[PDB]
Design a protein around this ligand. Structure first.
Ligand SMILES: Nc1ncnc2c1ncn2[C@@H]1O[C@H](COP(=O)(O)O)[C@@H](O)[C@H]1O
Length: 278
C-alpha cells in the first residue's frame, strides 16, 4: 500500500551547503529534537516513537539542501519513524522515489535505497568520500534530474553515489553522533583547503547496526525484578562501543525497539501522544 502525507511533512529542516560547521551541527541536532518522543529518552538521548501499526508509512519530514542562501533547495522526503530516505524532488518538480509504487505520483529512480542497492555491499561504506564538495555535487546531481532525461549507465551511477552521499551526511548523521561529528569535522571556512574523508570501520559497523545498538542501550533501562542487578550493557566490539556511556555518546537518536521488559509499541505510542507527539 502507498505511503500517506509524503508532501505533508511534520517539519522541514534546511541546510545551506556552504554554511559553517556549527550551523551543520545545529541543523542535525534540530532534526533529532523534532523527531524525538518527548516521553521516552535513554541515557538522555532521544528515542524515536514506535512505527505506527496497521497503516502504511504516514509520518514524514522534509530536508531541504540549498546550494546557497538564495537558491532553490533539493527536497528530501524522509520517514519520521525510522529516518528512511524514500523520495527527492528535482528542480522541475518531479518527485523521485527509491521504492517502486511507494509515493503517490512519484517516478522510480531506477534503484533502491539500501547500501546493497547503492554500492553492491554494505561493506563498501568505507569507500564513500564525504565532505562539503561531495555534498554540493550530490545536491547538484539529484536536483538537476529531469523527468524527460534518457537514463544512462553513467548517470545512474552518478545518482547512486549522490544518494549514498546524502544518506551518510543527513540520515546517518542524524542517527549517530559519531557520523555527525565526523562530517562536522570536514566542514571548514573558505580560508581552509577543500577537505574530504571516509568513515572508518567502527562507524561502518554502527551505520550497519543502528537497531542493534539502539536495542543494546534500551535494555539497560529495564528496571530489574526486585533483589536483582541492573542489566549491564552488552559490548559491541565491532562498533567500538563497550559501555552504556559510550553507547550514549554514539547514538544521535535511537530507533524504537521492543526489548523484553521495556515499553511496547502500543505503550510508547500512548506516551508519545500524551506528550503532544504527532
Ligand atoms: N531508505 C533508507 N534510508 C535510510 N536508511 C536505510 C534505508 N533502508 C535501509 N536503511 C538502513 O538499513 C537498516 C536495515 O534496514 P532493513 O533493510 O529494513 O532491514 C535500517 O535500520 C537503516 O539503518
Amino acid at each position: 500500500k502507498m505511503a500517506k502525507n509524503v508532501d505533508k511533512p511534520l517539519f522541514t529542516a534546511t541546510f545551506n551547503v556552504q554554511a559553517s560547521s556549527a550551523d551543520y551541527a545545529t541543523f542535525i541536532a534540530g532534526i533529532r529534537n523534532k523527531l524525538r518522543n518527548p516521553a521516552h529518552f535513554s541515557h538522555n538521548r532521544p528515542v524515536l516513537p514506535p512505527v505506527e501499526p496497521n497503516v502504511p508509512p504516514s509520518r514524514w519530514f522534509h530536508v531541504v539542501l540549498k546550494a546557497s542562501p538564495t537558491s532553490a533547495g533539493l527536497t528530501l522526503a524522509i520517514r519520521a519513524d525510522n529516518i528512511y530516505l524514500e523520495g527527492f524532488k528535482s528542480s522541475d518538480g518531479t518527485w523521485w522515489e527509491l521504492t517502486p509504487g511507494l509515493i503517490p505520483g512519484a517516478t522510480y529512480v531506477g534503484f533502491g535505497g539500501t547500501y546493497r542497492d547503492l554500492l553492491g555491499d554494505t561493506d563498501k561504506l568505507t569507500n564513500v568520500a564525504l565532505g562539503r564538495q561531495q555534498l554540493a555535487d550530490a545536491v547538484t546531481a539529484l536536483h538537476g534530474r529531469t523527468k524527460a532525461d534518457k537514463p544512462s549507465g553513467p548517470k545512474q551511477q552518478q545518482a547512486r553515489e549522490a544518494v549514498t552521499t546524502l544518506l551518510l551526511m543527513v540520515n546517518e548523521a542524524t542517527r549517530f553522533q559519531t557520523v555527525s561529528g565526523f562530517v562536522a569535522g570536514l566542514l571548514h571556512p573558505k580560508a581552509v583547503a577543500a577537505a574530504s574523508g571516509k568513515i572508518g570501520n567502527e562507524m561502518k559497523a554502527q551505520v550497519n547496526g543502528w537497531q542493534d545498538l539502539s536495542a543494546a542501550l534500551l535494555k539497560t533501562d529495564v528496571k530489574p525484578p526486585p533483589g536483582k542487578s541492573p542489566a549491564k550493557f552488552a559490548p559491541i566490539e565491532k562498533m567500538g562501543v563497550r559501555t552504556a556511556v559510550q553507547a550514549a555518546n554514539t547514538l544521535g537518536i535511537l530507533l524504537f525497539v521492543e526489548v523484553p521488559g521495556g515499553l511496547t509499541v502500543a505503550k510508547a505510542l500512548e506516551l508519545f501522544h500524551a506528550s503532544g507527539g504527532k
